[PDB]
Amino acid sequence: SSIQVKNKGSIKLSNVKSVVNSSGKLVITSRNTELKLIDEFGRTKESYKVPYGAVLAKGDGEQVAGGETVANWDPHTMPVITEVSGFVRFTDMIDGQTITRQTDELTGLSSLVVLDSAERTAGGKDLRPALKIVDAQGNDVLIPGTDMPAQYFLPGKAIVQLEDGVQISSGDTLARIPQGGLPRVADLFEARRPKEPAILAEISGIVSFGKETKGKRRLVITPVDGSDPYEEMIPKWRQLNVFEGERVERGDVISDGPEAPHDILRLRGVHAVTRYIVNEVQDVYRLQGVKINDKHIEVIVRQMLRKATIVNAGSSDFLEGEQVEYSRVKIANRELEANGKVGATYSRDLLGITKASLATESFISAASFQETTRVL
Amino acid sequence: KSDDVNGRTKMYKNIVDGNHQMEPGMPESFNVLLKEIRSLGINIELED
Amino acid sequence: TANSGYLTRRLVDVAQDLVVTEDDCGTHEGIMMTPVIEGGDVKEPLRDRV
Amino acid sequence: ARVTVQDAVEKIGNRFDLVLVAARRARQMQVGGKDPLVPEENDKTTVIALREIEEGLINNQILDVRERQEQQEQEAAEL
Amino acid sequence: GGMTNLERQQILTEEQYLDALEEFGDEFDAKMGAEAIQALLKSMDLEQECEQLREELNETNSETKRKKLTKRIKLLEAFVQSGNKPEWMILTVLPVLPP
DNA sequence: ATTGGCACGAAA
DNA sequence: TTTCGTGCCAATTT
Structure with missing residues (x-):
């Protein structure tokens, strides 16, 4: 529901992109914001994750006491709140092709509901409905700190709260989107990919959608100074959490779920994956009181x-895409670096214990372990 | 202690003589394994 | 019991050849160690980790 | 008798080298005609070697020097 | 295959083989059993195969075909570098274990 | 039973 | 013509 602090100390925010709303409170527009409790000594004691679109009672560096609510948000509803304050105009918003009109029977407080590409007509398939924030003069109000105009797209199953021509401000929700043991250790050490992996980003930069329902949905990442034409295949049947109007980093998630160690190694490095594995194994072992x-x-x-x-082959004899020993590559590179040449470049690979033990240089040990016929 | 035919006899003789030393030797099961692998049409051998 | 035995056999097989064969390698790389904090509770202090 | 070998380990510095040095000394005292450097009290060659190592009378360098001296004396007295 | 329109590894059937014999005669050779496999392995040149596969690999662009070509090239290179020969995988003399 | 590699079939 | 999914086979279980 909400973060409930237990002790008294200073509040710190990490990876925070927050703005003051109309009411005077603070709303976070960053996905990877973390809230920490640091006392006067400087040692953190409590850590929490703040979801996207949450209201903070206090600010950074303020002093709070135990038994106090520091943050509050709606778990089932994902806010799509804005940053600039102004009137809302509907662009590419056509009823009967992209959205629908549904009136609540009892409450009576309802507005248009944005349809999805799996239900809307073909004509609206190529149309992206959007809400644009303007001023009293009708001009596009540029977001402070940037230059691009302020418009926000709406995905499917979005329930518009306020109708057209109604003034809004910062922090106002435009639409609502409804939502161990021994085998665990064995799966952790075998580096098995989970049934529903978490979808990450390979390269940084702004993000955008692509062709819709071409078997499965598509995503495009445009780096500021990188390779634009990169694109990714992502099924649309899973609840996505990407922000097409926000820049995402390679160390950021797109969907949610358990994360595969291979992706962690590929995107974040050796330290991240070893820390994740150690923490998971120790979490499993600690619940039983075992000290290792x-x-x-x-x-x-x-x-x-x-x-x-x-x-890349480089100056070494290694071919384009062969898998080899890390120590041999290190020896070859340190030998070639003393000759004035340029060594080869490599990427680390993660193998399970069963698979890593079958790829040793000695065939006697591999035949002694298992799968004697294939190894021999 | 298990499968070195000459080593067992030498160790027993040394123990009876009050000399607690051994000559390790080669296990026989390794030779059996080598013969069995050679019977499959695979040339496995010790070198040097 | 059988699952535990299989797991420990695989663990022994994957790391049987690792032996301390040097006194110092001269590297400067390392890992950052911090206390383990989950929510508002500290399950592992820094003393037992370093 | 012996219950602990901590002092011998401290003298030698390593548990793995202590075993080798003690085995060498015990084999010298058992197969060879060497006499113990400590007053033996119904002890076996391994325990006697451990006690000699603890007192500091026996180490690898001392054994090497003794072997070199014995070889030189034998080669000199051969003629 | 000879001068006919039969490839070097086409699989025939009994009726197809009889028709080929009655039409083309002795201009083609067809065999069955391990002798045919040994003949196919014995007449295969490894260096030319490696070079042709490398040319096909570096020219065309694909993912699964690229992996298959890489695997076959690796197997061919493993055979070439070692002293083994492809036809040795067909047994002619059978070892007998000591009694 | 469970997991992973491989050939096959349908689709972009 | 490439690319992802589905059915089949082989490996494992003190």
Whole structure:
């Protein structure tokens, strides 16, 4: 429901993009904002995650006491609140092709409901409904700190709250969108991908949609100074959480769910994946009161990270896409660097314990482990 | 202690003589494994 | 019991060849260690981790 | 008798090298004709070697020096 | 295949083989059993295959075909670098275990 | 039973 | 003509 602090201390916000609403409170427009409780000594004691579109009673650096609500938000409803204050005009908003008119029977407080591409007509398939924030003169009000005009798109199953021609302000919701044990350790050490993985971003920059329902939906990422034509395939049947009007980083999620360790290794590095594995294993073991040092899990993770994939041949004899030993690549690169040449470049690979133990350089040990016929 | 035919006899003789030393040798099961793998048409051998 | 035995056998197999064969490698890389905090409770202090 | 080997480990510095040095000394005292450097009290060669190592009378360098001296003396007295 | 329109690895049937014999005669050779597989393995040149596969790999663009070509090239290179020969996978003499 | 690799079939 | 999904087979279980 809401964050309830337990002790007294200062409040700190990490990765926060928040603005003051009309009522005077603070609303967060950043997905990866984290709230921390740091006392006067400087040691953090409590940490929480603040969802997108939440109201903060206090600000950064303010002093709070125990038993106090610091943040509040609606869990089932995802706000699409704005930053600039002005009138709302409907662009590419046509009834019977992209939206529908449904009136509440009892409450009587209802407005147009934005339809989805799976229900709306074909004519509205190529049309993107949007709400544009303007001033009393009708001109587009540019967002402070930027130059692009302020317009927000609306996905499917969006219930518009306020009708056209009604003044709004910052923090006002335009629309509402409704929503262990031994095997766990075995899956963690085998690096098995979960049934419903979490969908991440490969490159940074602004994000946008693409062709709709071409088998499955598509996404496009345009970096500020990177490679624009990159694109990704993402099914639309899963509840997405991307912001087409906000820039996303490669260390950010698109959908939600359990995250595959391979993606973590590919996108964040060795330290992130080893920390994730150690933390998961220790979380599993701690509930039973078992005390195990982290050195053992660290050496296991190190043994899992024993393979590399070449990304360019370079001066070495390694071909374009063969999987080889990391130590051999390091030895070859340090030997070539002393000759004035340029070494090859590689990407680390993550293997499960069963798969990593079958890829050793010694065939006697591999045949002793299992799958004797194939190894021999 | 298990499968070195010459090593067992040498260790027993040394123990009876008050010399607690051993000559390890090669296990016989490894030779059996080598023969069985060779019977499958695969050339496996020790070198150097 | 059988699952525990299979897991420990795989763990032994994957790391049987790792031995301390040096005194210092001279590296400067490392990992950052911080206390484990979940919500408003600290389950693991920094002392037991470093 | 012996219940602990901590002092011998501290003298040598490593548990793995202590075993090798003690085995070398015990084999010298058992198969060879060497006499103990400490007053033996119904003890076996391994315990006697451990007690010698604890007192500081036996280490790897001392054994190497003794072997070199014995070889030189034998080669000199051969003629 | 000879001068006829039969490839070097086409799979025939009994009626098809009889028709081919009655039409073309002895201008083509067709076999069955392990002898045919040994003949196919013995007449295959490894360097030319490696070079042709490398040309096909570097020219065309694909994902699954690229992986298949890479795997076959790796197998061919493994055969070439070692002293083994492809026809040794067909047994002619059978070892016998000691009694 | 469970998991993963491989050939096959339908679709962009 | 490529690309992802579905059915089949082989591996594993102190």
